[PDB]
Design a protein around this ligand. Structure first.
Ligand SMILES: [Mg+2]
Ligand SMILES: [Mg+2]
Ligand SMILES: [Mg+2]
Ligand SMILES: [Mg+2]
Ligand SMILES: [Mg+2]
Ligand SMILES: [Mg+2]
Ligand SMILES: [Mg+2]
Ligand SMILES: [Mg+2]
Ligand SMILES: [Mg+2]
Ligand SMILES: [Mg+2]
Ligand SMILES: [Mg+2]
Ligand SMILES: [Mg+2]
Ligand SMILES: [Mg+2]
Lengths: 100, 49, 115
RNA sequence: GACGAAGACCCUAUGGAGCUUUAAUUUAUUAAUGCAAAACCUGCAUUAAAAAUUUCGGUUGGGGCGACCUCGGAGCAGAACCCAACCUCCGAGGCUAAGACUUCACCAGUCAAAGCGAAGAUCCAAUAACUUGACCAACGGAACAAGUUACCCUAGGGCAAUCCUAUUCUAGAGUCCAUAUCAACAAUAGGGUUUACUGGAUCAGGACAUCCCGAUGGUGCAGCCGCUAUUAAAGGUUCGUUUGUUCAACG
RNA sequence: CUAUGUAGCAAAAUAGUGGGAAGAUUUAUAGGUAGAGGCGACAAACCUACCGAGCCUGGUGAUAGCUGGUUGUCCAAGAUAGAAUCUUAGUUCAACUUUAAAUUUGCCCACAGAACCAAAUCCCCUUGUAAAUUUAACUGUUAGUCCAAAGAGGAACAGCUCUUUGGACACUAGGAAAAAACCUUGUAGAGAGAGUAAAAAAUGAUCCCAAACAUAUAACUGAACUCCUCACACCCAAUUGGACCAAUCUA
């Protein structure tokens, strides 16, 4: 089945490469990390992968999460893991095309 | 309970694909995509499969 | 199961009782280790055969020199039970481009010139 | 004693030869009919008998009986990946395109930025077609083949949960009293339990955990004998009726 | 029916004891039935010594996932993931191995990092190293045993089936008595040199089983490990690469 990380921290991942294959949401998508229908995480932008811990604010459109956050004491928060890809190359450059 | 039926179009004929329909339901017609002209056309069933 | 062993760092902490028991000193440590193998690689896991093959310790006693830097100590902490480490001693300094061919290593670990 | 120099028994082979069939395929040959052919033979079809060719999946209590055979989810497999089970518990049968993942092969399988447009295999048959289905569930699938070989042949392989017994607390008894006797449970010891879902004659060697003979202690034997206990293996340890998993009964 | 005989006088006899012996008897002579056939007072009995299917020649060098074999010298690399299969006595793919060739990173590895519901593992900067990937081309092995450990099954046992991490064996040598699996040790030759490694016990059934020793200073002994003088390709199975070559014929 092999539902685990496939690009670990500090790895150079190109566009479209799968970062993590999972069953439940162990690792939530972050910056430049997209999700598929099967919860696979894939790298949208070429770069370097990092993992972080952040605050969780679910979609109100979702129901199984918008209510549990409604059951938490003052000063509470649901922290969760995220996997980002800091992009490496810039979008583009400008080069002389015509001298007229 | 359900039957696969070869649905065919009317304008830009020749299309065929086996779609599903509940057997308890009567003859089926839909508005969907014909790529010969790439337009919305009425597709109707011809023969159950 | 049987697994690699991660030695807690607490053991590698010389005490005030150990320092006067061997000829060492906390401050101003020693440049080079002279290391010899006194045990067989056979009958031991492969992650020690490879380490020994990497430190040049393939042959038996046959002393060999290595830096005293943590990148090598991490390797010697895995094979510390198949080797004897002594500190090289230079009571006459590094040899010059003359006296390279007239050196000698005594059993106490001192490198000297012209026997 | 040199496992001293024919014959059996168990298992295997996509070996062989059979037998029976309500196992699969056939009617070529015969016999009936039926239809055309010029009172008989020729051709076609249907029905039957008679045969002919052919096969006997896999894991397994103890081989058989009986289940299951593909895919999926939970512990083993505590924390990247993978890891068995007839181990442990349950169900299912729009087009184009950078990059990647994978059920440890392959075959299959899986995700997907941007961009353009709309919101259970192969082969076969029917097919103009756009493509299409059942079986293949023994679920990597012979297109269609069962029961059985006590007449078989060849190539080959072949430190016990539950318990039995003795010593420990005596605690329960024994007309009074644990020690004259059983001594319940347990504990400490030495020893086995394979079926369900090999004797006799002949000669015997040996141990003692002793049946007798020998020596000793206590006795509730007041005494021979009895009872238990220690010691003792030099010697001995019957003849018959019925019957042969080998014992048992009886004189 | 018994005894002899069992390479015997004989590939079924001898000696005795027995059944029939005017009948469904026994027998000489010529002919007939021919192998999926004959014949059979059915026993799978007999058809020229061996018939659940004669014998000979041919197809035939039948086929054989099975058994057995496989021939000069020397050197070198060289071993136990797995999947499918009328498949587990075999094959194909992978993994591992070998050779030739191309290229540049491979292994070890701290800090950082991998979830909500104990051992460790994964990943890389450095560092010690010199290997690794890729391409071309083939064969061979494959579901091994024991020991330490963590689990599942059988007690937490039955020396029990299975999964996983490691070691060893199938390679050398020395020890524990003999000793594949424990401990010590590897790269190979000559030496009538040397230093070491491991390594000694405490307080039921043929016939016990080294002999002995309480008190003279702890060191010594002990390998193919290492050093020494010289020389070096000269200690694995299956497989793979290489250097030589006996004898015969020909130019
Ligand atoms: Mg077979
Ligand atoms: Mg057969
Ligand atoms: Mg599972
Ligand atoms: Mg599997
Ligand atoms: Mg795959
Ligand atoms: Mg798009
Ligand atoms: Mg099958
Ligand atoms: Mg299968
Ligand atoms: Mg042959
Ligand atoms: Mg086979
Ligand atoms: Mg070699
Ligand atoms: Mg790294
Ligand atoms: Mg040597």
């Amino acid at each position: 089945r092999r539902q685990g990380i496939k690009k670990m921290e500090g790895h150079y991942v190109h566009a479209g490469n799968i970062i993590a294959t999972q069953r439940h949401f162990r690792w939530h998508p972050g910056a430049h990390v997209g999700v598929g229908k099967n919860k696979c995480l894939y790298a949208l932008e070429e770069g370097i992968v990092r993992y972080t811990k952040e605050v969780y604010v679910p979609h109100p459109r979702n129901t199984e999460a918008v209510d549990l956050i409604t059951r938490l004491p003052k000063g509470a928060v649901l922290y969760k893991t995220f996997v980002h890809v800091v992009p490496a190359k810039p979008e583009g450059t400008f080069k002389l095309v015509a001298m007229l | 309970k359900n039957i696969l039926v070869r649905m065919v179009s009317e304008a830009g004929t020749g299309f065929c694909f086996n779609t599903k329909r509940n057997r308890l339901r009567e003859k089926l017609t839909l508005l969907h995509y014909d790529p010969v002209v790439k337009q919305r056309v009425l597709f109707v069933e011809k023969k159950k499969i | 199961k049987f697994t690699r062993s991660r030695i807690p760092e607490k053991v590698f902490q010389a005490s005030p009782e150990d320092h006067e028991k061997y000829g060492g000193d906390p401050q101003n440590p020693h440049k080079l280790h002279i290391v010899t193998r006194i045990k067989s690689t056979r009958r031991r896991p492969y992650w020690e055969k490879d380490i020994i093959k990497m430190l040049g310790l393939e042959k038996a006693h046959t002393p060999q020199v290595h830096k005293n830097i943590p990148s090598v100590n991490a390797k010697l902490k895995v094979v510390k039970h198949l080797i004897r480490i002594k500190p090289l001693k230079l009571p006459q300094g590094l040899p010059a481009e003359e006296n390279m061919s007239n050196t000698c290593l005594k059993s106490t670990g001192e490198l000297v010139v012209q026997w």
